[PDB]
Design a protein around this ligand. Structure first.
Ligand SMILES: CC[C@@]1(O)C[C@H](O)c2c(cc3c(c2O)C(=O)c2c(OC)cccc2C3=O)[C@H]1C(=O)OC
Ligand SMILES: CC[C@@]1(O)C[C@H](O)c2c(cc3c(c2O)C(=O)c2c(OC)cccc2C3=O)[C@H]1C(=O)OC
Ligand SMILES: Nc1ncnc2c1ncn2[C@@H]1O[C@H](CSCC[C@H](N)C(=O)O)[C@@H](O)[C@H]1O
Ligand SMILES: Nc1ncnc2c1ncn2[C@@H]1O[C@H](CSCC[C@H](N)C(=O)O)[C@@H](O)[C@H]1O
Lengths: 334, 334
């Protein structure tokens, strides 16, 4: 009992079997009509004997079941590996896309606990975002994964703040601009600017065009460790600061403080440290990037170092469906 | 629900957190009196902030619990990570010992499914047993791990066969000689020979000496792909053949057939393919070694190729305590 529990918790084969199934698009091939192990093997370009041994573990953990002899089909849980499922778990487990690939850094977790430093570079040759800057496929899949974290498409954070006195929003590291878009739909008088890295700026521009928002949201390529491209009344850091150790996060916050208009505020949208998934995201930040999730008291110190104070934390954001784990910290000049 | 289930099954951070805790000997340090995170950090030579983030996940998965503020203790499941626990799970999860280290091969499982070939060499530079031959620390921990698979110390397989008409036993790849020892205690008239690799032969010799069996069990250093050192009435292959692809297993079986006395038998002691843990061991063999677990029908073909027939399979072996997953196949000249 206790022995079986410990063995399952410590098992490396099971998560790699799940990720291999996702990378091979196994459930998609089954749902597209691959009824036999020979057809599945052919569509995935794998050895049939080896694929069957993978399938045997997929059956044992309840992702596949045998309907007829030799005919394997997804269970209710396996169906979440279909590529069009809205939770996007296939892509989140795909070893050729940015996050599951980055998760290999966990194989060197002892080094990260001994040093406090990320292990991603020791495995892939460059730190996380520099590796993405050299790999257009990983840059693109990362940006797409970041748009599948929550089901409101930033509607819930955009609704948690009053935009009446805001004329311009600067979305610092704003990904493909989904947050800037949600504010624009919410608040017709606001204009916005997204500051992002090379590669990402082009998909942000295409996304904002296709929303019909090109006239209201601009995109600037740049580095948020440098002086920001313009001033704004609200400056958004959405899942940015957790990517960075304290001294780097203070540098970013300081650049934002310097770009605030009088009366402006900085909005940090992030999962706060205090259930489910908190330790996964925190340890991801450690081994990918050297970042961390932060408590309120930790945020107080970071803000003070940047000439700011935490005015308000708008607690875990609500959706009609699956709850957002994230919060909105509102920061003002000290 | 289904989403949380899939996310837990696909999680790489949880098994690496367990293995990191085992490698750091975290539970041993707690039980030896490390009551604070600062004391634990000092004994494990880790950063206190990073160690706490590891501990937070260890609490979330139920291996540790907080007794007093800042004082972490093993749960009933965490206690199995104590190094002296008889299930030996600490060593089985220790990333500096041979098996948990080998499990990193699972990070390249897609390659193994595409090619049918093991991934261990692509990661560590040499195939499994050649890597052990160059690493005395891994050779030794592997040999020790192989003595902790079952709780009877080979008493159950030794009791599953009638030794009356056996005068000499050859234990081919017999590890530290634990199986030869169990037969010797069971059957006072039998002498035995263990055939093993360099390094392992010395710990076999020390173990057999310390059992008081040096006069009854010899150890020979050699290669079981070469002609065997002598003939015997029973030739044991205990958790050997699953290490090898079919053609290599046939070579071994053939060497054994050539060394059988008239009326002799070959005993294969292995987990047969047909619950819990079957797919783990099978996929381990794939990615470590290119081996596999085999069904009865597969064994029939291998035996026939070696000039043998399966006479009898003595089904899953029984213990008074935790059941042995293994079986004993009895093979005779065709
Ligand atoms: C179901 C929750 C969630 O889908 C969304 C959660 O927000 C979240 C996840 C993963 C990542 C991030 C997340 O925010 C990142 O912010 C992130 C990052 O920061 C910009 C830089 C690199 C990688 C990641 C990352 O892999 C997922 C999770 O399971 O974690 C518990
Ligand atoms: C609780 C079961 C068990 O403790 C014992 C089970 O017999 C078993 C295990 C691990 C290994 C082997 C086992 O036989 C090997 O034979 C082996 C091997 O073969 C000689 C060569 C390299 C690695 C291994 C190996 O890691 C464990 C397990 O959990 O697997 C489901
Ligand atoms: N120096 C830098 N300058 C500008 N953006 C950077 C940067 N370093 C990292 N980033 C960006 O920071 C982002 C963090 S991922 C978060 C994206 C988006 N805000 C969201 O909530 O979904 C990435 O898109 C990355 O491109
Ligand atoms: N070419 C070879 N010649 C002899 N032994 C070999 C060998 N290749 C691998 N081995 C041995 O095969 C063993 C398989 S592990 C099984 C050990 C033991 N029979 C038990 O049941 O516990 C290892 O000890 C390894 O040293």
């Amino acid at each position: 009992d206790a022995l079986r529990t410990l063995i399952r918790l410590g098992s490396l084969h099971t998560p790699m079997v799940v990720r291999t199934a996702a990378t091979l698009r196994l459930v998609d091939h089954i749902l597209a009509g691959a009824r036999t192990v020979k057809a599945l093997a052919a569509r995935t370009d794998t050895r049939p004997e080896a694929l069957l041994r993978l399938i045997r573990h997929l059956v044992a953990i309840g992702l596949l079941e045998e309907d007829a002899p030799g005919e394997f089909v997804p269970t209710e849980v396996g169906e979440l590996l279909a590529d069009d499922h809205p939770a996007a778990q296939r892509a989140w487990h795909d070893l050729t896309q940015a996050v599951a690939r980055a998760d290999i850094s966990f194989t060197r977790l002892p080094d990260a606990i001994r040093t406090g430093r990320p292990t991603y570079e020791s495995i892939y040759g460059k730190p996380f975002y520099e590796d993405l800057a050299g790999r257009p496929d990983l840059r693109a899949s990362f940006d797409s994964l970041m748009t599948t974290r929550e089901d409101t498409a930033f509607a819930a954070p955009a609704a948690a703040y009053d935009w009446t006195n805001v004329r311009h929003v600067l979305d610092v590291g704003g990904g493909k601009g989904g947050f800037a878009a949600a504010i624009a739909r919410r608040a017709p008088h606001v204009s916005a600017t997204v500051l992002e890295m090379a590669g990402t700026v082009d998909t942000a521009r295409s996304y904002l065009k296709d929303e019909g928002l090109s006239d209201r949201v601009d995109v600037v390529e740049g580095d948020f460790f440098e002086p920001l491209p313009r001033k704004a009344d609200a400056i958004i850091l959405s899942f940015v600061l957790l990517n960075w150790p304290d001294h780097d996060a203070v540098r970013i916050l300081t650049r934002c403080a310097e770009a605030l208009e009088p009366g402006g505020r900085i909005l940090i949208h992030e999962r706060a440290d205090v259930r489910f998934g908190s330790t996964l995201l925190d340890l991801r930040m450690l081994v990918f990037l050297g970042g961390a999730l932060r408590t309120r008291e930790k945020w107080d110190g970071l803000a003070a170092s940047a000439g700011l104070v935490v005015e308000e934390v708008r607690g875990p954001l609500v959706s009609p469906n699956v709850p957002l784990d994230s919060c909105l910290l509102v920061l003002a000049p000290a």
